[model samples]
Target: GAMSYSLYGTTLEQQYNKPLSDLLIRCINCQKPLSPEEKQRHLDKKQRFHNIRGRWTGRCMSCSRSSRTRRETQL
Candidate 1:
């Protein structure tokens, strides 16, 4: 499942100018598929943090993809 987060300030899309699809693709390249339990853990972590905007930010996806790539390259 995909999650959304809020990044405060207007024109975030314009300022960042990074397409969601591209971000997701890059994230996919960097991470692995998360288990349901892992996803829940991420959500729990988010709840404890604040002051940032932009839902989800694909952080988890990027992390997963990156980790997978590293592991593969190590082999």
Candidate 2:
């Protein structure tokens, strides 16, 4: 069996097993599915230090509809 150290111990093994919720950083507008490149980038950044951050800055199909309706054009 192998043993690993904690964050204070500075062991790489401690980097393993991050929670699924922590990995989830999705769209800001629709909060829908994740794009291919977007998912890759999120995972890649997390791999470096296993830290999680939240933001609201993406959009999806619904975003278009919401945005369109949000603005009422004069007839």
Candidate 3:
């Protein structure tokens, strides 16, 4: 089996980002951009989101596609 959620890869659900109008959110873990749904998860204080690095507006990705490729490699 693969990963689940739009941010992560899984055959059951497929992975893709919903577009933002003209805003961008950053994940503290990798500082890479996140989508609207992902940012909402961050804002809502969902478990995938974090309480560190200040504000609910700031959070981490399920996987960072930037310099933090080791997790991607592990996957």
Candidate 4:
């Protein structure tokens, strides 16, 4: 079985199967900004460690949240 790696819900296999340039383009949407309230809670949970993590993908809850709601309204 292949190893599992998810970048903002896009699988490693899916990305690896595509071109490197496309990965960066696709990642544009993956790295969404967090809302003020959500950022506050997130910082609180992490004890204000604002430094970036090595494995950080810069994805935000609102990214998928809005995507889900947008699809919901469409269908």
Q: What is the C-alpha lDDT of each candidate?
A: 0.32, 0.33, 0.37, 0.32
> 1-75, model 3: which lDDT tens digit per residue?
222223321111221232222234455554566655556553344334332222222344455224245442235
Residue by residue across 1-75, what tens digits does model 2's lDDT show? 123221211222233343323334344444544453444333444222222233222333344336554322212
What's the true lDDT of residue 63 in model 1? Answer: 50
On residues 1-75, what C-alpha lDDT tens digit does candidate 4 reach at each position? 123333322232233464222323211135433443433332334212121222223224544345444431234
Tell me the spans in candidate 3 whose CA falls farther than 4 Å from its real position: 1-21, 46-57, 61-75
* Per-structure clash totals for the candidates: 17, 0, 0, 0
Where does the lowest 10-residue lDDT sum fall in candidate 1? Answer: 47-56
Model 2 RMSD in angstroms: 11.9
Candidate 3, clashing residue pairs?
none
Candidate 4, position 56, lDDT: 25
TM-score of each: 0.25, 0.26, 0.33, 0.24
Candidate 4 clashing pairs, residues 3+ apart or interchain: none
- Model 1 C-alpha lDDT per residue in residues 1-75, reported as the tens digit of each score: 223334322223343354222222212222333333334333444322111223222234445335545442234
Which of the predicted structures, 2 or 3, would earn the higher lDDT when compared with the native? Answer: 3
Whose lDDT is higher: candidate 3's or candidate 4's? 3
